[PDB]
Amino acid sequence: TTRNIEHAVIQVREENKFSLLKDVLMTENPDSCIIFCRTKEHVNQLTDELDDLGYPCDKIHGGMIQEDRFDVMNEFKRGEYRYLVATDVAARGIDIENISLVINYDLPLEKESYVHRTGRTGRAGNKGKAISFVTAFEKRFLADIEEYIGFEIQKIEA
Numbered sequence: 001t002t003r004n005i006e007h008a009v010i011q012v013r014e015e016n017k018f019s020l021l022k023d024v025l026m027t028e029n030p031d032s033c034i035i036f037c038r039t040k041e042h043v044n045q046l047t048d049e050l051d052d053l054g055y056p057c058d059k060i061h062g063g064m065i066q067e068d069r070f071d072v073m074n075e076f077k078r079g080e081y082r083y084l085v086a087t088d089v090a091a092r093g094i095d096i097e098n099i100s101l102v103i104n105y106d107l108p109l110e111k112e113s114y115v116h117r118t119g120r121t122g123r124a125g126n127k128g129k130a131i132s133f134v135t136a137f138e139k140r141f142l143a144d145i146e147e148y149i150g151f152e153i154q155k156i157e158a
Helices: 014-028 040-052 066-077 111-117 139-149
Strands: 005-011 033-036 057-060 083-086 101-104 128-134
Touching (some): 014 033, 014 040, 040 083, 057 066, 066 083, 111 139, 128 139
Parallel strands (some): 005 128, 033 083, 101 128
């Protein structure tokens, strides 16, 4: 069955990622979105910053006990919030019917992860999108991903 995922990369400096995320969310205005980070520390910081600005969100990472990760994912499945901030642990066993937008706030440093993160996007007729933030120091990691998925990802601005 045909998967429908538009992929895009945005080159951005680390210190300007949060400002970029706010613009992307404003422009994409997704009904459901998962924002992946590399470490639980990044997840915690990003959730605090989103919280302080009034964004309805929640988080999932390896420092949380199993029942909390489960309950947080159920609230997401019920649509109680639009943005889930998470590490790759949220992608394992992920079974939520659909996630419209995947944002790799931190580009995956292991190529298989890029595909794993888009696991519930663009399926069964849903139109999906994956936007990755890439710094000047991650060009080789991006090239690894592109050779792995078999195609180059379009770089876009703003």
